[PDB]
Curated annotation (Swiss-Prot), chain B:
The name this protein goes by in its record: Major capsid protein
Lineage: Viruses, Duplodnaviria, Heunggongvirae, Uroviricota, Caudoviricetes
Other notes: Displays an HK-97-like fold with an insertion domain that protrudes at the capsid surface.
Protein location: Virion
Oligomer and partners: Interacts with the auxiliary capsid protein (via FD region). Interacts with the head fiber dimeric protein. Interacts with the head fiber trimeric protein. Interacts with the portal vertex auxiliary protein.
Native organism: Bacteroides phage crAss001 (Bacteroides phage PhiCrAss001)
Organism superkingdom: Viruses
Functional summary from the UniProt entry: Capsid protein self-assembles to form an icosahedral capsid, with a T=9 symmetry, about 77 nm in diameter. Each asymmetric capsid nonamer is covered by 9 capsid auxiliary protein, 1 copy of the trimeric head fiber protein and 2 copies of the dimeric head fiber protein.
Swiss-Prot record, chains C, D:
Location in or out of the cell: Virion
GO CC terms, sorted: viral capsid, decoration
TM region positions: none
Entry remark concerning the domains of this protein: The central region FD is structurally similar to Helicobacter pylori flagellar cap protein FliD.
Keywords associated with the record: Capsid decoration protein, Capsid protein, Virion
Top-level taxon: Viruses
Identification of the protein by name: Auxiliary capsid protein
Curated annotation (Swiss-Prot), chain G:
UniProt signal peptide: none
Subunit and interaction comment: Homododecamer. Interacts with the Cargo protein 1. Interacts with the major capsid protein.
Entry protein name: Portal protein
Lineage: Viruses, Duplodnaviria, Heunggongvirae, Uroviricota, Caudoviricetes
UniProt organism field: Bacteroides phage crAss001
Compartments in which it is found: Virion
Segment of the intact protein contained: 253 to 353 of 806
Function statement: Forms the portal vertex of the capsid. Probably involved in head assembly, genome packaging, tail attachment, and genome ejection.
From Swiss-Prot, chain H:
Disulfide bridge map: none
Protein's name in the database: Major capsid protein
Additional note from the record: Displays an HK-97-like fold with an insertion domain that protrudes at the capsid surface.
Signal sequence, start to end: none
Cellular compartments annotated: Virion
Taxonomic placement: Viruses, Duplodnaviria, Heunggongvirae, Uroviricota, Caudoviricetes
Coiled-coil annotated residue ranges, if any: none
Amino acid sequence: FLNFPRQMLPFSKKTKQWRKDCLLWANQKTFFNYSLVRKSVIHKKINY
Amino acid sequence: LMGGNTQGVPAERLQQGERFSIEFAPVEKELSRKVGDVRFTSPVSMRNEW
Amino acid sequence: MVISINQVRQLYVAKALKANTAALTTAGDIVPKADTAKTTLYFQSMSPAGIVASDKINLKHVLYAKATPSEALAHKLVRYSVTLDADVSATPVAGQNYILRLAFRQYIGLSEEDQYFKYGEVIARSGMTASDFYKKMAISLAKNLENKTESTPLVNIYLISAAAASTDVPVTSATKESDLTATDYNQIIIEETEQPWVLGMMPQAFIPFTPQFLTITVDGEDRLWGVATVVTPTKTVPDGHLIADLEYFCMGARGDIYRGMGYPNIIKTTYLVDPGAVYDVLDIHYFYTGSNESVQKSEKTITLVAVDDGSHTAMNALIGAINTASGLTIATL
Amino acid sequence: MVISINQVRQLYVAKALKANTAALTTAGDIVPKADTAKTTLYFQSMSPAGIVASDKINLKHVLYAKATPSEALAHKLVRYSVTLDADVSATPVAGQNYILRLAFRQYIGLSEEDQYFKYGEVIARSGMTASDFYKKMAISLAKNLENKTESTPLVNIYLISAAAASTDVPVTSATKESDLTATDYNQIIIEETEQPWVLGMMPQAFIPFTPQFLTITVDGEDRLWGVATVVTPTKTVPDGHLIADLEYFCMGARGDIYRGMGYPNIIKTTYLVDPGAVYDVLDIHYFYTGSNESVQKSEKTITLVAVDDGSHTAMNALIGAINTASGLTIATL
Amino acid sequence: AFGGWLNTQGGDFTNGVTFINEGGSHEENPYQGIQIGVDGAPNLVEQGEVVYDDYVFSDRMEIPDDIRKEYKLRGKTFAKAAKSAQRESEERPNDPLSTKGLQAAMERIATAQEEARQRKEAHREG
Amino acid sequence: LLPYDLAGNLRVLRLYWKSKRKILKVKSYDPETGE
Amino acid sequence: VLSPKDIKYIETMPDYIGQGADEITVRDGTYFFDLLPYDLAGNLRVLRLYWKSKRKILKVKSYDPETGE
Amino acid sequence: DDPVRNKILHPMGGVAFSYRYDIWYIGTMDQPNIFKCKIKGDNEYRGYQWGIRNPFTGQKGNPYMSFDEDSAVIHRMATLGVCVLDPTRTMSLIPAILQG
C-alpha cells in the first residue's frame, strides 16, 4: 500500500482483502497527526 | 551560454553600453535548487506652496 | 529505407575474404564456395553468432551479375551560379530593389505540391559595383537561410572571387562584410546540402531548388535582373548512408521482420556496415525453376558489399574469388 | 544495466586529447579545460552532434578523484580441482557408482534460492586406473555441461595431465575416449563461463557453483568420495561489457531518459564505446555548495573513460592533462 | 437528471418546464409514450416534447416563417423554441423576474403553436 | 506493535472511516399525476 | 454536482503526514528529527467567491384591460 | 534451510545450518521463557523531511520547508531486543563447520 486503499470503488470490489488492507494501514500510518484544533497527547497527559 | 550555442557569442555583443534584460530562470526536473529573484521600485515626490 | 524487390534480396557484408570454411574467425568474413563441377554457388559467411550459408545459386540459372563502384552511388550536389544579367545591366542600377526567390519543391512530403520559398533582398546604391552586389546579396541569403535557430540546413551559399576562380568563398550567417575583403566577385553559387539520416526510419533524400528573380525597372521596362545556370557539381554525398540503409532492410529477409517494435521483447540484429565508409556493391540476380510443372521462376538476388579505399582492392578481390570458383564473367571495376 | 548513483553520474569517453576547443574534429574528443585561476574544471567534449561541456567542477569541492586500471575490473572465472580423496581409496573402488553433483546458484534468476543441479557419473570397474577414471568422468561431466542443447553456458571442464601439469586439454560433448590419449590424468578442472551479454538489457552476471560429491561405500562405511579445492583462477572476462553498459546508463542523464520505448518514435543516440576493448575508468566525485544558511552538498560524480592498450597510455595522457590544467593530485596509474 | 432541473446544494429546483426524455417516440414505446398523466386518460408524451403548465410543446411540428417573424421564436421546432426560451430561467428557478420572464414567453409559444394547429386544420379540411 | 498487556489484556483497535459509495439519482414520472 | 473526474482529484490527496514538532534524532523513544491546496492534515481548499454581477432587465409599462390603469 | 543467509555448504549437501538441532522448549516454565522485548509506546517514527513536493504523502506545497531541494527522505527507526529467561531450558546442537 501507499495511502489508504482506493475508496472510489464499486461495492463488489470491496472484498475481504480490500477491507483488511484498509485496516492494516490504520495499524501502521496513523500515529502522527497535525491536529488543527487539538493539543498534543504528551501535552494532555501532563495535564492529567 | 544557454540556447544551444556551440559556436560562441561574438565580441561585438559584449560591449559597453549594451543593456541586458531578464527573461526567466530554468532549473532541471530532478533535484532542483533555488534560483531567481524579485525586483522593486520606489516613488519620488513633488512640491508646491501657497 | 524501404526498397523494391522483384523477389527477395539478401545482403551479405564482405568485410574480409578467406579461402577456407575453417578460416572464418571474425564477424564479417565470407568465402565463395562451389562444387568442382560448377553446378551451384553459395557464400558461407560469418555472422556474429555463427556461420551462415547463402542460397545455392544454380550456375545455369543466373540472369545478370554486375558490380557497381562507389562513385556511381554518390549523389552529386547541384550548384546554381547566379550572376547579374548582362543585357539588363552588368552593374546594379541605383535605387532598385533586387530580390531573389529560391524555390524549393520537396520541402517536407514527397509531392512537389509541398513547396518552400526563401528570399534574398538588396537595394542598390549609386556607388555599388557588381562585385559589391554579390557581397551584399550572399550576406542576405545566408541571413535568411543558414540561421542557426532553424531546424535543418537547406542550401549552402558561396561567393566566387575571379582571382582564384575555383576556390569557394563560403558565406554563413556569422560572416560580416568586413571578412569579405575581395573586390572582384563575379557570381554567387547556391549549392544544396546533405539532409540528416537515421537508418531505417529516415532515408537519405534531398531538397531540390531553383532560384527565381523578380523584375526591376531599368529603363521603364520591368526586366528580371539575373540569370541562374547550373554548373557542374563538385561536392558529392558518400555511399555510407545508402549501404547501411540497404543492409537494414535486407536483414529482415534472413533475420526478423519485427525490428525493435515491442521494445524490451525483441531480437536485435547486429549490422556489419559502418555508415562512415564508402562501399562497392555486387549484385547476382538468379532464379529457381522446379522439376516438372513448377516452371515459373522465383527471380531472386543476392547482394554483397565490400568497403573500398580509393582503388577498389577489396571488391576486385571479391569478384576475383567468385570467377575462379563459379565460372562467371563478372566485370572487375 | 542499472547502477547505483550518488545523486547523479555522467560519463564521457576520452577517445582523444586535443589541448584546445579549436582542434576538436572527430567524435569523442576530450580537452580538460580550466582557467589560470584554478577554480573551475570542465571538459569540452566533442559529441557526435556538436561540442558539449560538463557541469563546472569547483576545485575546492572535490572529494575523491581516483583512476582505476583495466586489470581491476576483470571477473576471475573460478576453478575447482576435483580429485580422488586418497584417504578413502587411492584407486576407484571397483563396484561403486561414482557420482558428482554440481550445485548452481544464480540459475536464470538472481537470488541464491534459484538453483540448478547437474551431475556426472562413472561406474568404477576393476583394473580402472585413476587416469582412466578422470578420462571417463571428464567426458561424462562434459556430456551434461558442455552440451550443445543446454539453454545457457554453465561451466568449462578440462583435464590436467601429470607430465605438463600447467596446460589444460578441453573436454566437450564431442571428445571421445580416443582423443584424450594420456595415462597420467590427476585432476578434473571445472571453470566458470562468461554468460551471454546484451547491451543495456542483459547485464554481465555469472552463475556460481559448488562441486559436491556423493557417498560410495568402502569396508561398509559410506565415505564421501572426493575433495574440491578452489585453485587460483587463470581466465578473466575483460572490461569490455561493463563499460559498454556504463555508457548506456549514463547517457540517459545527459540526454533522453528512455531508450527504445515505442519504435517508430525514438531519438537514436550514437554510442562511442567499442564493447570489444578494455577500458580504464576515472571518477571525479564532487559537490555544489552555496552561500547561505542552506549551504551543503549536492553530491555529483563525473566518469571519464579512456581506452587501455596494455600500459595505460591513453588514460595517463588524460591524467597528465588534467594535472596541469586543474592542479589536482590524481595518481597516474 | 438534468432535464429542466437545477440539482444544486442538495436540493431539486425546477422552473416548471418538464423535459420529457429517455422514452422514445410514440410508436417506438411499448406503452406508446411516457404516460406522464392519466388526467383524457392516455396523456402520452414522447422523447422530444416539453411541458409547461400541463401544455405540451410538440417536437413533430416545424416553425413557419409567418409565425417566426411574429411571436419571435428562435428554434427550428416548437419544442426547440421552448427549449431556448427557458435557458435563462433554468439556472435561476427562484428568481421573481425570471419566473415572470418564463411565464410570459411560454404563453407566446402557446399562442404560436395554437395558431399553427388551426392553420394546419384549415389546410387539411380545405 | 504490542498485542498484549501485562495484565493479560488484548489491544483492540477500532477503526471507522467514511468510504465512498456509488448511488444513482433516478427521476421517475408517476403515472397518476405527472409530478 | 461533482463530476467523477473531480472525485478522482479528491481521492488522490494527502491523508497521512509523519513525525513533526539526514535528521539528527533527539528525545530518545519519542524521537524528534532536527494558497496551497492541502493543509498537511488531509484537507481541501474550498475557496468560495460571492459577488454582485450586473443584470440587464426591463421596466415595462402596461395597461390593465378592465380599468385604464 | 534458507540459502540466501546460510552460505557455508555442508559436505553432505545443503546449507550447513540445516544440520543444527535445537530443542527450544524443555518442560513447562509457568512464564514465557523466550519472548520478544518491545518498548511500550515506541511506535516507529515515520519521519519525512522534504522540500516543495512530497512524493510519499503526496503533498504539493509545503508551509514549513526543511530545505530548498526537490527531495523527500524517509527516516524510520526501531528500538528492539529479545530475552531468554532460562537458557538452560534450551539445548542446542550446532555443526562445528559454522565455527561457533
